[PDB]
């Protein structure tokens, strides 16, 4: 589990979204596993804008911060889960890292600010939906 919260926005994996962000959706892409609500506080995160490769993701099942370096938002092949069919998720960044399908939502960050949200993994794999192309998050 987790979220991003920026400005007036609640970002989290569309697998986990609740029926209170469904019922204030701003935007959802089942391409990349994500959702965006609206919030009524402001948020306490920033986005980091830049091309950052290396960083630091939050993994709930281990209860620690890890460094990582990870792969460029690209189109990987996941495989068929209880959300989904077998299909491409865009957007997604790949590295070497501990993870297990709870540790949806832990943030990833660079020193310019969030950089995504763990969506995937592996065996000692861990897969990040990015958000730092989605500009409008900061207006
Ligand atoms: C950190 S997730 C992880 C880690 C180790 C081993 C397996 C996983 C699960 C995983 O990769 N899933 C893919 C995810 C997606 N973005 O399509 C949906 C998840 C679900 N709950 O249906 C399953
Ligand atoms: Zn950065």
């Known amino acids: 589990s987790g979220a991003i919260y920026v400005g007036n926005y609640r970002v989290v994996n569309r697998h986990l979204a609740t029926h209170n962000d469904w019922a204030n959706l701003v935007w959802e ?23 950052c490769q290396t960083g630091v993701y939050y993994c709930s099942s281990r209860r620690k911060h890890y460094p990582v370096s990870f792969s460029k938002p690209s189109l990987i092949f996941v495989e068929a889960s209880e959300y989904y069919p077998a ?18 939502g832990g943030i990833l960050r660079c020193q310019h600010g969030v950089v995504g949200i763990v969506s995937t993994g592996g065996n000692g794999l861990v ?12 207006e």
């Open 127 to 138: 897969g990040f939906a990015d958000v730092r192309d989605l500009l409008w998050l900061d």
């Open 29 to 51: 892409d089942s391409s990349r596993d994500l959702l965006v609500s609206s919030t009524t506080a402001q948020g306490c995160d920033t986005i980091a804008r830049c091309d």
């Open 87 to 104: 299909r491409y998720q865009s957007h997604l960044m790949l590295a070497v890292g501990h993870s297990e399908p709870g540790d949806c």
